[PDB]
Design a protein around this motif. Structure first.
Motif, mmCIF file in Angstrom:
data_model
loop_
_atom_site.group_PDB
_atom_site.id
_atom_site.type_symbol
_atom_site.label_atom_id
_atom_site.label_comp_id
_atom_site.label_asym_id
_atom_site.label_seq_id
_atom_site.Cartn_x
_atom_site.Cartn_y
_atom_site.Cartn_z
ATOM 1 N N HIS A 287 135.289 35.104 -34.220
ATOM 2 C CA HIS A 287 135.079 33.796 -33.631
ATOM 3 C C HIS A 287 134.634 32.780 -34.650
ATOM 4 C CE1 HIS A 287 135.985 35.619 -29.943
ATOM 5 N NE2 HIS A 287 135.713 34.515 -29.272
ATOM 6 N N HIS A 288 133.577 33.117 -35.372
ATOM 7 C CA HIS A 288 133.098 32.232 -36.399
ATOM 8 C C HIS A 288 134.240 31.826 -37.309
ATOM 9 C CE1 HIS A 288 130.209 30.236 -38.907
ATOM 10 N NE2 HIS A 288 130.655 30.881 -39.971
ATOM 11 N N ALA A 289 134.967 32.819 -37.802
ATOM 12 C CA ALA A 289 136.096 32.564 -38.674
ATOM 13 C C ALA A 289 136.976 31.475 -38.098
ATOM 14 C CB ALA A 289 136.916 33.830 -38.881
ATOM 15 N N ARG A 290 137.363 31.654 -36.841
ATOM 16 C CA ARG A 290 138.299 30.739 -36.217
ATOM 17 C C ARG A 290 137.758 29.323 -36.200
ATOM 18 N NH1 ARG A 290 138.528 28.824 -32.486
ATOM 19 N NH2 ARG A 290 139.753 28.239 -30.660
ATOM 20 N N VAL A 291 136.468 29.163 -35.923
ATOM 21 C CA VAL A 291 135.867 27.835 -35.904
ATOM 22 C C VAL A 291 136.004 27.183 -37.271
ATOM 23 C CG1 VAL A 291 133.627 26.634 -36.027
ATOM 24 C CG2 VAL A 291 134.201 27.975 -34.028
ATOM 25 N N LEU A 292 135.528 27.884 -38.292
ATOM 26 C CA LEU A 292 135.520 27.359 -39.656
ATOM 27 C C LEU A 292 136.884 26.807 -40.016
ATOM 28 C CD1 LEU A 292 133.408 29.862 -41.786
ATOM 29 C CD2 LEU A 292 132.713 28.270 -39.955
ATOM 30 N N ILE A 293 137.910 27.659 -39.920
ATOM 31 C CA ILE A 293 139.279 27.273 -40.270
ATOM 32 C C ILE A 293 139.565 25.885 -39.723
ATOM 33 C CG2 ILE A 293 141.754 27.631 -39.893
ATOM 34 C CD1 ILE A 293 141.190 30.647 -39.862
ATOM 35 N N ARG A 294 139.298 25.714 -38.432
ATOM 36 C CA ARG A 294 139.566 24.458 -37.771
ATOM 37 C C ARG A 294 138.725 23.387 -38.428
ATOM 38 N NH1 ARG A 294 142.191 23.085 -35.262
ATOM 39 N NH2 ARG A 294 142.206 21.867 -33.308
ATOM 40 N N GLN A 295 137.423 23.606 -38.538
ATOM 41 C CA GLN A 295 136.501 22.517 -38.898
ATOM 42 C C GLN A 295 136.770 21.799 -40.230
ATOM 43 O OE1 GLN A 295 132.330 23.055 -37.948
ATOM 44 N NE2 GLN A 295 133.124 23.186 -35.859
#
Ligand SMILES: [Mg+2]
Ligand SMILES: [Mg+2]
Ligand SMILES: [Mg+2]
Ligand SMILES: [Mg+2]
Ligand SMILES: [Mg+2]
Ligand SMILES: [Mg+2]
Ligand SMILES: [Mg+2]
Ligand SMILES: [Mg+2]
Ligand SMILES: [Mg+2]
Ligand SMILES: [Mg+2]
Lengths: 185, 141, 126, 57
Positions: free
Chosen positions: A123-131
């Motif tokens: 989940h964290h990973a996915r957020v970062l990519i976007r941000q």
RNA sequence: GGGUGACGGGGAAUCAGGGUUCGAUUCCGGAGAGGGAGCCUGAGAAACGGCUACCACAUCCAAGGAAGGCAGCAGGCGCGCAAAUUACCCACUCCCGACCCGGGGAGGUAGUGACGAAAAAUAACAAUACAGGACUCUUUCGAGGCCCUGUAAUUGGAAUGAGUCCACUUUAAAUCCUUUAACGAGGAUCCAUUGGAGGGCAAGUCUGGUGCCAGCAGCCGCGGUAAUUCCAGCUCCAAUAGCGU
């Protein structure tokens, strides 16, 4: 008359028997494993896969030594190796049909951002990519789904202008430093 | 048996061409009749005017009254008994009021307990019943 | 200081009387460096002033440490007001244009269809 | 025959109530996470003659 | 001969293989410019943003006369289930002209736009209180924590775009994206819907009201005073910037 393309397709197919249950279970298990957003995201992969599996069927019906198969097949494999799905040595076409969803998720950005430490949970990973926090090669990839070539993988990390990867700290920390300086101090 | 031979195509084809007109559906599409017979002249919905509110007594085993609306269409000038769906919904509809009406899921065939009611009401005075029934929108005055 | 400008696909157009190339501006941390600032860099690079330099079409990338755009450097202002788009001269106002605004022209020309010969009235019209 | 009278009979007289105030429900992906977690990873217990997700004795 | 809800084709939607259906619509061909007829010009027209007639519609008239053609682009009325701005520009593509220079509702550019298609937020992490289970330990009870999952306290600051907005870039001139300063989150918030939960068909024999009424129900059915089928509350399920009809 105009300019304008109009050329466009879907990316997925919705399943006919629409509450197979076992289907639902496996599909959510996939959403859990690889932090997907939605039932579609599974389905759009499942649609990519199929297309490859179809082509590979069509090539197997041809005769061997026939220039069409030898050419396409090679390319289709060379493509699949480049994304880190099929292995060199395992390049010989019949081995494609033996292939699956899970392998095509494995080489997402998010999945390789989680795997390559960096993140701290899928989940964290996915957020970062976007941000706008992680960059591949040099460009900042914004898009989770970015399938990462086998070539590219070792060059994935944070962006050069973004907190985690040595950068000016974000506005939250920036505010609290102003609070500690002017307010508290 | 079949005709089966090689230079038969025509005999085969023409035979099936004939037999298509014993397929109830095919006939519906390819004879005129049906298209002529619908008050919605092959349209998904049609506007009309509510010329009275009508008590429809339900089909035997399910005893009730259904609350319908005698519409008269604009395009055709034909008439209908449109079903008004949902509870207390009939009261939204007033006489001489501009209903959009639809089919009722069954493409000509009548539905459920109502007898001979092909149509349901959708919008009244350009508002949509669902909205009224929910309480999102209000009837204009 | 921290900008950098690189060049690419450079052409020496003898017959349009111009050096024309792609500029590719690495510029991280700042906000698509302006066209004035690009032309003064190009001048020091090419030792050939800014007046003959015309720059346009800069697109900045996603992420943001790179822009990309076409520019050319005429052999002289003599030439740069000859084989050059008018709008782009007007970008650094040396060949501005009239302010009739189309529609007013069309309606004048649609009259005068009405009248024959009257040089002064045809001049008048509106 | 039969009147068009009673019409909204029930819906009218039912005992109206407010719809409480619980929470902003998690949406999009996060919702899906939470769903996934409660089928597969949290419980996974010893079985006792089949399950129920909204069952209540 | 009649019919066609018939302009033809490239193609489009469906599809195992066969098929079925569609193709007014951005390319090619054709046809027509309210309807019918005739013709001048000209290489090319039986041109309609050319004429001459009739008919049909319409407009001023000093009543003798005179002028008209959006199935160009905008726009309106009308028709309907059913469809966008009287916007900017010749900068691009191309065309026409005596023409490097003029002109172009062709053409582009915005605006309208949930036709449809692509990406894709609506939270992520921690230690806590705890609640559980593969390991190690323990007869069981309990414990050591590489492993971890749920609910809370928002407890904790960290990250961020939506947004507001200087400035570039864009561009014909702009907008949009893009880049970018400066402000910009504790969920009372920056609040995710649409449908369903007896079977088909994922999911309540829960709790209130109704009493074969109102109502639901594509079909089988539910409803006649303990309704898993109605109207409500609670929970749950499916899909989700979407989902019904
Ligand atoms: Mg016809
Ligand atoms: Mg013609
Ligand atoms: Mg007309
Ligand atoms: Mg003609
Ligand atoms: Mg015209
Ligand atoms: Mg419409
Ligand atoms: Mg046009
Ligand atoms: Mg979309
Ligand atoms: Mg929201
Ligand atoms: Mg069901």
């Amino acid at each position: 008359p105009v300019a304008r393309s109009w050329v466009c397709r879907k990316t997925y197919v919705t399943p006919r028997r629409p509450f197979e249950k076992s289907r639902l279970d496996q599909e959510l298990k996939l959403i859990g494993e690889y932090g997907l957003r939605n039932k579609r995201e599974v389905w759009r992969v499942k649609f990519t896969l199929a297309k490859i599996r179809k082509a590979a069927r069509e090539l197997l019906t041809l005769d061997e030594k026939d220039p069409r198969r030898l050419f396409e097949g090679n390319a289709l494999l060379r493509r699949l190796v480049r994304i880190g799905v099929l292995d060199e040595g395992k390049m010989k076409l019949d081995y494609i049909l033996g292939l699956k969803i899970e392998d095509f998720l494995e080489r997402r950005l998010q999945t390789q951002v989680f795997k390559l430490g960096l993140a701290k949970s899928i989940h964290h990973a996915r957020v970062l990519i976007r941000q706008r926090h992680i960059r591949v090669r040099k460009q900042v990839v914004n898009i989770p789904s970015f399938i990462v070539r086998l070539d590219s993988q070792k060059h994935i990390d944070f962006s050069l202008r973004s907190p985690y990867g040595g950068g000016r700290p974000g506005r939250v920390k920036r505010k609290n430093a102003k609070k500690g300086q002017g307010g508290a101090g | 048996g079949k005709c089966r031979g090689l230079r038969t195509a025509r005999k085969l084809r023409s035979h099936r061409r004939d037999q298509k007109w014993h397929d109830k559906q095919y006939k519906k599409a390819h004879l005129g009749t049906a298209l002529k017979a619908n008050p919605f002249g092959g349209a998904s919905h049609a506007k009309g005017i509510v010329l009275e509110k009508v008590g429809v007594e339900a089909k035997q085993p399910n005893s009730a009254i259904r609350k319908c609306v005698r519409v008269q269409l604009i395009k055709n000038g034909k008439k209908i008994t449109a079903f008004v769906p949902n509870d207390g919904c009939l009261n939204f509809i007033e006489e001489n009021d501009e209903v959009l009406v639809a089919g009722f899921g069954r493409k000509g065939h009548a539905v459920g307990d109502i007898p001979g009611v092909r149509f349901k009401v959708v919008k009244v005075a350009n508002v949509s019943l669902l909205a009224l029934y929910k309480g999102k929108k209000e009837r204009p005055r | 200081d921290t900008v950098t400008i690189r060049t690419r696909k450079f052409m020496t157009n003898r017959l349009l009387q111009r050096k024309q190339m792609v500029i590719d501006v690495l510029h991280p941390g700042k906000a698509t460096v302006p066209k004035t600032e690009i032309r003064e860099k190009l001048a020091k690079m090419y030792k050939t002033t800014p007046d003959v330099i015309f720059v346009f079409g800069f697109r900045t990338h996603f992420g943001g440490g790179k822009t990309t755009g076409f520019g050319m450097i005429y052999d002289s202002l003599d030439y740069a007001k000859k084989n050059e788009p008018k709008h782009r001269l007007a970008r650094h106002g040396l060949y501005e244009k009239k302010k009739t605004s189309r529609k007013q022209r069309k309606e004048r020309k649609n009259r005068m269809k009405k009248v024959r010969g009257t040089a002064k009235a045809n001049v008048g019209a509106g | 025959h039969g009147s068009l009278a009673r019409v909204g009979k029930v819906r009218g007289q039912t005992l109206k109530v407010a719809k409480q105030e619980k929470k902003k429900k998690r949406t999009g992906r996060a919702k899906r996470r939470m769903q996934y977690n409660r089928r597969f990873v949290n419980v996974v217990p010893t079985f006792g003659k089949k399950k129920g997700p909204n069952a209540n004795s």
